[PDB]
Amino acid sequence: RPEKWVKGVCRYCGTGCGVLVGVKDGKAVAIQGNPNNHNAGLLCLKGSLLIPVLNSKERVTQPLVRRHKGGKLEPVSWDEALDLMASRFRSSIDMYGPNSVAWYGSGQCLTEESYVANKIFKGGFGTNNVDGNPRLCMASAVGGYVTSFGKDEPMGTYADIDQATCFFIIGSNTSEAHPVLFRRIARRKQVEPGVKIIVADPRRTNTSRIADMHVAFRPGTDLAFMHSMAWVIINEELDNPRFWQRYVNFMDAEGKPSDFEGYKAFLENYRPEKVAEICRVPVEQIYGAARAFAESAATMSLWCMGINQRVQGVFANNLIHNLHLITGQICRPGATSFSLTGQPNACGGVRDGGALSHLLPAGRAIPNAKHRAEMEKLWGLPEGRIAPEPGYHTVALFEALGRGDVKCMIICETNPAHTLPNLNKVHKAMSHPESFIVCIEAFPDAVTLEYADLVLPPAFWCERDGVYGCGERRYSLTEKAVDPPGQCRPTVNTLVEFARRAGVDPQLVNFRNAEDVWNEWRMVSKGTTYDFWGMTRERLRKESGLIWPCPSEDHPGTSLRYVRGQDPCVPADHPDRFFFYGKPDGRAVIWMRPAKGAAEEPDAEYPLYLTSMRVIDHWHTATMTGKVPELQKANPIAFVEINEEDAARTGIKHGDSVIVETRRDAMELPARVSDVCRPGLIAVPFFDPKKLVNKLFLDATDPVSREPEYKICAARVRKA
Ligand SMILES: Nc1nc2c(c(=O)[nH]1)N[C@H]1C(S)=C(S)[C@@H](COP(=O)(O)OP(=O)(O)OC[C@H]3O[C@@H](n4cnc5c(=O)[nH]c(N)nc54)[C@H](O)[C@@H]3O)O[C@H]1N2
Numbered sequence: 001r002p003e004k005w006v007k008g009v010c011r012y013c014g015t016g017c018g019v020l021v022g023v024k025d026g027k028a029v030a031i032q033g034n035p036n037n038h039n040a041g042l043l044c045l046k047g048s049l050l051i052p053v054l055n056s057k058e059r060v061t062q063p064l065v066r067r068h069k070g071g072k073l074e075p076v077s078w079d080e081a082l083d084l085m086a087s088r089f090r091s092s093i094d095m096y097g098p099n100s101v102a103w104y105g106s107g108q109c110l111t112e113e114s115y116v117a118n119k120i121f122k123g124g125f126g127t128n129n130v131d132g133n134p135r136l137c138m139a140s141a142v143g144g145y146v147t148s149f150g151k152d153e154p155m156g157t158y159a160d161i162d163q164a165t166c167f168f169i170i171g172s173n174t175s176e177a178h179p180v181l182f183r184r185i186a187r188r189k190q191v192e193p194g195v196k197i198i199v200a201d202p203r204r205t206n207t208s209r210i211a212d213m214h215v216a217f218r219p220g221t222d223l224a225f226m227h228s229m230a231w232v233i234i235n236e237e238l239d240n241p242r243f244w245q246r247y248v249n250f251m252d253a254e255g256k257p258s259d260f261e262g263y264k265a266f267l268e269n270y271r272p273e274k275v276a277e278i279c280r281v282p283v284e285q286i287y288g289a290a291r292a293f294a295e296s297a298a299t300m301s302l303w304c305m306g307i308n309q310r311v312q313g314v315f316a317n318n319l320i321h322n323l324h325l326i327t328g329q330i331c332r333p334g335a336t337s338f339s340l341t342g343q344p345n346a347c348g349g350v351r352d353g354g355a356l357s358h359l360l361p362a363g364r365a366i367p368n369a370k371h372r373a374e375m376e377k378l379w380g381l382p383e384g385r386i387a388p389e390p391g392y393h394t395v396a397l398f399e400a401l402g403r404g405d406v407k408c409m410i411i412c413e414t415n416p417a418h419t420l421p422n423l424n425k426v427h428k429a430m431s432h433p434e435s436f437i438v439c440i441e442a443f444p445d446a447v448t449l450e451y452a453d454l455v456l457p458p459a460f461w462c463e464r465d466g467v468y469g470c471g472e473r474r475y476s477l478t479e480k481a482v483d484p485p486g487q488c489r490p491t492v493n494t495l496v497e498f499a500r501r502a503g504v505d506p507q508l509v510n511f512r513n514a515e516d517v518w519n520e521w522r523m524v525s526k527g528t529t530y531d532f533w534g535m536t537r538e539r540l541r542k543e544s545g546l547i548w549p550c551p552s553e554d555h556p557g558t559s560l561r562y563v564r565g566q567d568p569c570v571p572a573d574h575p576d577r578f579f580f581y582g583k584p585d586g587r588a589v590i591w592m593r594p595a596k597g598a599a600e601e602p603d604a605e606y607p608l609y610l611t612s613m614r615v616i617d618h619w620h621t622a623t624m625t626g627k628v629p630e631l632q633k634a635n636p637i638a639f640v641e642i643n644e645e646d647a648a649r650t651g652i653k654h655g656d657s658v659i660v661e662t663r664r665d666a667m668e669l670p671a672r673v674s675d676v677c678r679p680g681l682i683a684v685p686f687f688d689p690k691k692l693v694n695k696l697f698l699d700a701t702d703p704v705s706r707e708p709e710y711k712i713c714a715a716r717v718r719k720a
């Protein structure tokens with residue numbers, strides 16, 4: 001029975017549910033949803049079963065070191081570990097320059113931890129080799145928002161779910177991936193049965209059971225589909241000229257200035273009857289989706305990896321925004337283009353904090369000299385300290401590691417040997433005989449540890465305080481509830497000490513705790529369109545999150561970005577009601593992106609599309625949810641989804657052990673025959689360690705966002 005309730009944030013998905021941890025003095029005994037956060041006291045099963053994870057004894061509790069490659073990992077002193085880390089890094093820089101070292105973090109790191117590691121590597125060591133797992137996830141969405149709007153992050157919030165009359169949910173298994181959000185959507189349609197829901201996804205998931213229409217298009221053909229929708233919208237005069245004539249600019253297929261007539265001319269290449277067959281769907285779906293979208297009083301789009309993990313990821317994102325831009329379904333309650341963020345802090349930590357290889361904090365960019373100067377000034381650095389060239393993006397980083405270009409790397413709160421694409425190649429790279437890899441990891445079963453040279457024990461989740469920035473621009477504090485076990489220390493501290501010992505000027509890592517970094521980061525944001533200066537620690541302790549922009553302590557936060565009278569970044573006296581200030585002329589942009597396909601399409605030899613997806617019970621690599629026995633009762637191990645019509649003709653029965661094979665590897669999996677995967681598609685989950693499916697997937701990335709195409713590759717199947 002709890003004596004105190006410590007306010008936090010769920011450790012899992014980007015829905016970012018507020019949580020209250022009940023501690024019976026010393027130990028966490030219960031957990032309940034924070035009634036004051038957006039989730040209003042509700043949590044899904046994974047969140048509900050957080051305590052068994054926090055109290056698990058199967059943790060990394062003391063530093064470990066592997067004296068030599070291929071050898072046993074053994075205990076080592078914290079002091080001996082920090083000196084080892086600092087000497088190896090400093091030497092590498094002294095010998096080969098900053099670009100020989102790198103930081104590979106994640107959207108699961110507290111904002112404060114990502115900010116510190118970013119600053120160390122960029123302002124301290126002078127290398128921009130700072131990336132993270134959000135590159136495997138939200139990079140395409142960032143690209144989409146910056147190219148369409150000139151600023152990252154959604155312009156709306158979760159609250160828009162309550163006023164939308166239409167939901168266009170594409171490339172998102174919302175029920176299994178953002179449970180609390182799916183419930184809020186299902187609730188909306190229950191309160192108002194008139195609400196229409198279109199679910200576009202090659203797979204028929206539980207998300208489609210509340211859908212008015214399920215568009216099961218051929219993998220990769222959604223750009224054609226969405227262009228077709230705009231064709232219909234224009235053709236049936238369902239567009240909003242009063243809006244686009246005043247707030248939109250058009251760009252042709254070659255990226256040059258164009259106009260409405262050019263948009264119409266381009267769209268002629270995407271007529272419904274032609275696209276319906278490209279997409280392998282009934283032509284009525286194109287008309288229906290378009291009409292529901294444009295005729296509705298307020299439409300909201302929501303999408304996830306099915307859109308982002310694509311070589312055309314940034315373009316697919318632009319197409320979704322085009323729909324809202326041509327119809328004016330934006331900047332009003334219930335109407336917005338809402339990218340769903342997968343991780344708890346891919347937003348606050350990596351995106352907003354600029355902890356990616358080409359970024360600087362608060363929407364600054366490495367290639368921009370005024371930005372580099374601005375940062376050198378804020379961080380008290382000597383002119384020119386920040387390298388002008390962006391560092392390696394994730395896939396390139398592990399490639400550099402495999403070549404010996406990157407000799408020292410810190411992997412923190414991610415499991416790359418399990419989750420990076422094209423594993424066989426990645427494993428070879430991580431096995432470089434002369435590399436020095438330091439893993440900050442909470443659970444010993446993470447496969448990446450088999451590659452680590454030094455393992456450091458971190459304080460897990462609420463064992464320390466920190467901020468998480470979820471998908472709706474909401475910044476929420478998680479206060480420390482219990483003490484870290486064994487020798488576990490807060491990564492914020494471990495970083496500050498690693499820096500000092502590595503030679504970094506002490507004025508740079510001038511932090512005792514997370515609150516100290518929050519105050520500097522608060523300063524670094526001041527004046528920018530991210531400005532969250534009003535989010536003091538005290539306000540964050542008392543509030544269940546605040547949504548930025550939040551400039552002064554007396555400012556309530558912002559739900560409607562780009563809207564006069566709502567967004568503080570839009571002059572009180574701006575002449576127009578909307579202002580897309582991320583663009584020089586205040587106008588958003590519609591892009592006539594040509595629809596292509598996957599990097600590796602099916603052919604004679606490998607006739608099927610292979611996709612990979614989430615399952616509600618398991619969180620990623622399962623080093624955390626794998627400790628909760630209840631979560632293992634439905635899908636204990638991996639399987640391969642095969643379509644009914646394909647199985648029959650292929651001669652495969654349900655339960656059969658089948659070999660899924662791509663050009664990169666073959667893996668045996670039990671077949672799960674159903675109508676989930678449309679014909680010509682198979683799907684594998686990645687939660688099982690004994691079945692590392694990323695060994696099957698290709699390594700191609702969107703040339704702009706550099707996000708890998710985990711969603712599509714070519715395969716062949718056979719009975720084992
Ligand atoms: N239980 C649980 N929840 C999670 C996670 C977890 O590990 N476990 N992860 C969190 C994280 S990091 C993230 S990024 C989110 C992501 O969550 P989602 O992206 O919603 O989950 P996925 O299974 O990857 O869903 C992608 C969907 O894209 C489909 N798809 C495949 N090919 C295409 C295509 O060509 N076009 C389109 N439009 N769709 C396509 C798939 O069939 C699948 O249904 O989930 C979050 N939620």
Ligand SMILES: Nc1nc2c(c(=O)[nH]1)N[C@H]1C(S)=C(S)[C@@H](COP(=O)(O)OP(=O)(O)OC[C@H]3O[C@@H](n4cnc5c(=O)[nH]c(N)nc54)[C@H](O)[C@@H]3O)O[C@H]1N2
Pocket residue numbers: 106108133134136137138305342343412413414415416418419420439440441442443446458459460461612613614619620621622623624686693694697710711
């Ligand atoms: N085929 C395929 N591959 C994919 C995807 C896909 O859809 N298909 N999705 C991709 C996407 S969106 C993502 S987000 C990535 C994510 O994939 P990863 O980030 O690699 O997966 P996680 O299991 O979340 O890794 C987090 C690690 O943090 C550890 N950890 C937990 N708490 C702490 C802590 O406090 N400190 C430290 N140091 N470690 C801690 C865990 O034990 C675990 O090893 O996977 C990607 N890979």
Ligand code: SF4
Pocket residue numbers: 010011012013014015016017039042043044045046047048178179180181
């Ligand atoms: S919906 Fe996401 S943030 Fe909310 S309790 Fe579930 S896993 Fe946690």
Ligand SMILES: [Mo]
Pocket residue numbers: 136137138342343
């Ligand atoms: Mo993600």
